Design a binder for this molecule. Structure first.
Ligand SMILES: NC(=O)c1ccc[n+]([C@@H]2O[C@H](COP(=O)([O-])OP(=O)(O)OC[C@H]3O[C@@H](n4cnc5c(N)ncnc54)[C@H](O)[C@@H]3O)[C@@H](O)[C@H]2O)c1
Ligand SMILES: NC(=O)c1ccc[n+]([C@@H]2O[C@H](COP(=O)([O-])OP(=O)(O)OC[C@H]3O[C@@H](n4cnc5c(N)ncnc54)[C@H](O)[C@@H]3O)[C@@H](O)[C@H]2O)c1
Lengths: 288, 287
């Protein structure tokens, strides 16, 4: 890349982040399209976040990605939030449209976009959502807003159970999608849920390093063919869940899929251009 | 350049700016040394400057360059200024050291460096400074600090005249150099100086488009060989001042040399490294 006075800046505000891959990925996509943008990472926490936004505006940055621990706080500094973001209550993308700041959660749109790109239609379907954190909430919010008939959220009795309930409330009160929350301990309600589910989505940490050798699904007999299973965990690339999904004839979507489309969604929001997904997938070494 | 999450930001706050060459020049130099920094220009004016400084600190930028029209205002937003910066009253460089901002004016140090680099010792010498703008003021303050004998400043009857007056006072009260503000209209008193001068420095817009074929020097007469003629205008690389210069046999220092050294200084202030000046010169075609 050759940066000149013409280039505008796109940030990523989080902490820690100096070891983030996003900058390399977006800058590779940007250079490929020969666009006058540069994507950079800045160490920002809740204390400096306010001033960083003030910077975003004064310096006229095109926008910035947002990650831990500013995801929720960020909602307070934009001028407008999308419906899905309002349900999630957290954003990972900000777009500065000439001083007017728009907040987005591309984790939700990217996951669903990955689904649709596979030829799958979520309209009127049923999803078994594992989790209630940022990934799950974002997936579910977007999913509801895109047509899901019902979401059967399952979450253990931890610090996320109450968030689940509220999420269920917000979604039910502002969408035509019906959301229910069930304790992941009620193994009976789970099996039946999965049997009636068109999509099984894992938004939990389960399956991710170092606790890779584990899956929230007891036995492969719980899954059925035709069923679509999506994994948020992309580390390992092949979780246990995804491994079982194959041993059941289930179609699937891995973590890299959500990652690339999540990044593609931001790319388009900032440049208005399509994402060179294939190229980026290849250059970042995700194909193997 | 391959920007990653490890690169730190170095900006340029000014407006207009999207057509500046500092970015490429600084980014060519940085990539040349494989340094984890990226120089970027931001369209910022007096109104956005306060917010821009908040970003500089909050985003933890390594620093930023400052140009029109934020040079003067920038002094009010730093924690510490250099003696020259205080005399000049404006800065073009800001360095952020873990939250503390230091202001510098490399225009002066840069122009003086170019002088010294040609084998000239400004100490105890007389200079005829044309203009009182950002350039002239920077060169003068720095030149004074570095031993200049006296500064005979010449500026027309515009708003800068008063600026010249105020500038003369500041220097004459904090340096051993003696400055005098003379009306560029007194064509007579201009000879009395240009005659007994060691160096003639132009920091006015004359010489630069749309004032190309113009010069504050009526006849080659007033100028002879050996005389040092420094030109700040670099737009028309060969200003009418140079024509008369490289025709009267007076060694000169074009705006390219000043530009390169003023940039070298900022580079080093930010990265702590030596500026690949020769490399940049060639790549930027300044050669
Ligand atoms: N592919 C992508 O682009 C992408 C994007 C975002 C997050 N992720 C991944 O998704 C996962 C979730 O991230 P998050 O931000 O939503 O996390 P979070 O901490 O906000 O949520 C963790 C969730 O998982 C559940 N959970 C964790 N351990 C559990 C266990 N042992 N048993 C039952 N439930 C458990 C919790 O109840 C909670 O709802 C992470 O592995 C993350 O790396 C991937
Ligand atoms: N070498 C470098 O890196 C460098 C740095 C800064 C400025 N410059 C150049 O130097 C010039 C001056 O820049 P500045 O920032 O000092 O400008 P400024 O606006 O601050 O000052 C303009 C000066 O020129 C004088 N002037 C303008 N028209 C005049 C005229 N017709 N007759 C007599 N005097 C006249 C004014 O009195 C004033 O003192 C510009 O052309 C600029 O491109 C070069």
């Amino acid at each position: 890349m050759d940066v000149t006075a013409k280039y505008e800046l796109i940030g990523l505000m989080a902490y820690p982040i100096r070891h983030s891959l996003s900058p390399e990925m977006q800058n590779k996509a940007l250079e490929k399209a020969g666009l006058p943008f540069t994507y950079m990472a800045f160490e920002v926490d809740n204390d400096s976040f306010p001033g960083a936004i003030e910077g975003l505006k004064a310096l006229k940055m095109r926008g910035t990605g947002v990650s831990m621990p500013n995801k929720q706080l960020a909602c307070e500094y934009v001028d407008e939030l999308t419906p899905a973001a309002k349900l999630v209550g957290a954003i990972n993308t900000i777009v500065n449209d000439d001083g007017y700041l728009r907040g987005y959660n591309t984790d939700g749109t990217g996951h669903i976009r990955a689904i649709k790109e596979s030829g799958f239609d979520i309209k009127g379907k049923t999803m078994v959502l594992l989790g209630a954190g940022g990934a799950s909430t974002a997936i579910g919010a977007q999913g509801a807003i895109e047509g899901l008939k019902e979401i059967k959220l399952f979450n253990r009795r931890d610090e996320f159970f109450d968030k689940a309930l509220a999420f269920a409330q917000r979604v039910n009160e502002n969408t035509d999608c019906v959301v229910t929350v069930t304790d992941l301990a009620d193994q009976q309600a789970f099996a039946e849920a999965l049997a009636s589910a068109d999509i099984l989505t894992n938004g939990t940490k389960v399956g991710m390093k170092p606790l890779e050798n584990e899956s929230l699904v007891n036995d492969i007999s719980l899954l059925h063919p035709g069923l679509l299973v999506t994994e948020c965990v992309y580390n390992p690339h092949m979780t246990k869940l995804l491994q079982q999904a194959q041993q059941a004839g289930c179609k699937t979507i891995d973590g890299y899929g959500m990652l690339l489309w999540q990044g593609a969604e931001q790319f388009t929001l900032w440049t208005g251009k399509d994402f060179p997904l294939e190229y980026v997938k290849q250059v970042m070494g995700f194909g193997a």
